[PDB]
Amino acid sequence: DLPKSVDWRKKGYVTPVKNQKQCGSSWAFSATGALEGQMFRKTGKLVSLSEQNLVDCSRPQGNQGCNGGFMARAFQYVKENGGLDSEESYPYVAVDEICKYRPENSVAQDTGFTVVAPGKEKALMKAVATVGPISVAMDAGHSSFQFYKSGIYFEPDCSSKNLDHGVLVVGYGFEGANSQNSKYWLVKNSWGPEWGSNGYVKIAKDKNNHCGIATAASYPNV
């Protein structure tokens, strides 16, 4: 059955927290985070992937670089493109630039992606427990989120349907000795390690799909 808690950071699947800066590229960080987890599961090597490669090259698939995008379109680009470059070979500069994809520097691939369906928290829990980190969209458009520091985040103004930010669910847990209450999703953000709880946020779990975390979740197939 499903584990009481999961934290893929403790298993080597997750890279250190990154910073998208003033570019609307959270979708690219969410997609490289999911791909980093799946490549690690497949090869045993954790290699940081290039968000800039996605920002600069995936316009044909429907992404708009620093003006926004979608994780599923990014996984589609990696499939059609045949690869994705490492973060070291194609560094992040937080502005839209010319596509400079280099096949010789590719370190990741995908054949498509799987959508978490239904858009229910229990389905997301199954996906997190069996696959690894999962890309998700959420409603991060709140001052309370910008100033979040620690604890379980809950915001009455949060929408489960109108989402504006891509993040990565790396696990789930609970506070205390009881696994069924004070539950939370472990979410990796892309605002730097100085934001939030070391770059992470605990989003309330089993509180009616709070902030939309299970509404548009997906992961690459590697």
Partner: peptide, 6 residues
Amino acid sequence: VYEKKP
């Protein structure tokens, strides 16, 4: 509940 910065 949850804490805010600093």
